[PDB]
Design a binder for this molecule. Structure first.
Ligand SMILES: *[C@@H]1O[C@H](CO)[C@@H](O[C@@H]2O[C@H](CO)[C@@H](O[C@@H]3O[C@H](CO)[C@@H](O)[C@H](O)[C@@H]3O)[C@H](O)[C@H]2NC(C)=O)[C@H](O)[C@H]1NC(C)=O
Lengths: 120, 195
């Protein structure tokens, strides 16, 4: 399993951006998935999750500006970031969580990350 | 006869997060435990049934290689009667536990400049684990009352944290590969022995 982020760049504040993370490679079960971000010098904070049962949680900073969506058809994870403030500047990372099937167990994975950069 | 595949557990390139700990059933093989206890390379090596001398002389129906990474000050907790973040929420052993904990410092393998985010542990849980339970749930921890409504925020903890192993932490806060050997006798006579 090999996650790969994309989308994002420089953007004037109050604009929007769609992050895409694209899974590649199989595994013997289906797993939850998260967005993390790491600000300049601050550490990696959780942004959101989405689970097998289709439930989301969001971090209180982004609650209601940001939206997590999967298209399992294309093996693609989506972060809609709207009404971006400068605080939202960070390297953004997709993470796949664990799952079992039977004796086997899948650990998770992180991607390389992508830079969002929000001026004013 | 061929040779139990301890090779695959100990010399594994990657190792599990402690919340999401690996188990590897060992069956239908010789053993030779002495390759293990005579390594140089094991910082820790407590046995709790049995003198590891005389476990070479004995036979079991199955053997399990539980195997994760923690910080060094957590390796205290991988034992009978223990308590804290790791014993309570990530990997409990039973009070009657009879087998072997092995561990060793993996600061060279499992660290990176900026932090290794791959290893994680579980910080909160509505109760403690039963012996050998594992819990790979996400699910926002409700520390208050007044409920979370899937926001992570005040009293509303995303309950899996990363360790972020740098090679410039001190030994308490650097990563240790652990491996618990558990040994069960059953009906179906034997499978793993000693040559
Ligand atoms: C984990 O991996 C290491 C690295 O490949 C394994 O170490 C090797 O262990 C063998 C045990 O059969 C050593 O064997 C004997 O050593 C001498 C010289 O050191 C050699 O001349 C003999 O022919 C004989 O093979 C071997 O030296 C050692 N390899 C070296 C040089 O590093 C280890 O067994 C693996 N761990 C587990 C638990 O499987």
């Amino acid at each position: 399993v090999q996650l790969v982020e994309s989308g994002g760049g420089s953007v004037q504040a109050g604009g929007s951006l769609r992050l895409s993370c694209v899974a590649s490679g199989y595994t013997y079960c289906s797993y939850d998935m998260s967005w993390y971000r790491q600000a300049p010098g601050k550490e990696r904070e959780f942004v959101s999750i989405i689970r097998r049962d289709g439930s989301t949680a969001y971090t209180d900073a982004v609650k209601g500006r940001f939206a997590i969506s999967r298209d399992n058809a294309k093996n693609t994870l989506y972060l809609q970031m709207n009404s971006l403030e400068p605080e939202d500047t960070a390297m953004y990372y997709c993470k796949s969580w664990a799952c079992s099937s039977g004796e086997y167990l899948y650990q998770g994975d992180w991607g390389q990350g992508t830079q969002v950069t929000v001026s004013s | 006869t061929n040779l139990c595949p301890f090779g695959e557990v100990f010399n594994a390139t990657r190792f599990a997060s402690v919340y999401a700990w690996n188990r590897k059933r060992i069956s239908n093989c010789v053993a030779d435990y002495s390759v293990l206890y005579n390594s140089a390379s094991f910082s820790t090596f407590k046995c709790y049934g049995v003198s590891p001398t005389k476990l070479n002389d004995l036979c079991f129906t199955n053997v399990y290689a539980d195997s994760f990474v923690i910080r060094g000050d957590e390796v205290r907790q991988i034992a009978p009667g223990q308590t804290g973040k790791i014993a309570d929420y990530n990997y409990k052993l039973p009070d009657d536990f009879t087998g072997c904990v092995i561990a060793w410092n993996s600061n060279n393998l499992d660290s990176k400049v900026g932090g290794n985010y791959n290893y994680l542990y579980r910080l909160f849980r509505k109760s403690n684990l039963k012996p050998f339970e594992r819990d790979i749930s996400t699910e926002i921890y409700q520390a208050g009352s007044t409920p979370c409504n899937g926001v992570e925020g005040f009293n509303c903890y995303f309950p899996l944290q990363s360790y972020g192993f740098q090679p410039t932490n001190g030994v308490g806060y650097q990563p240790y590969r652990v491996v618990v050997l558990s040994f069960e006798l059953l009906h179906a006579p034997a499978t793993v022995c000693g040559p």
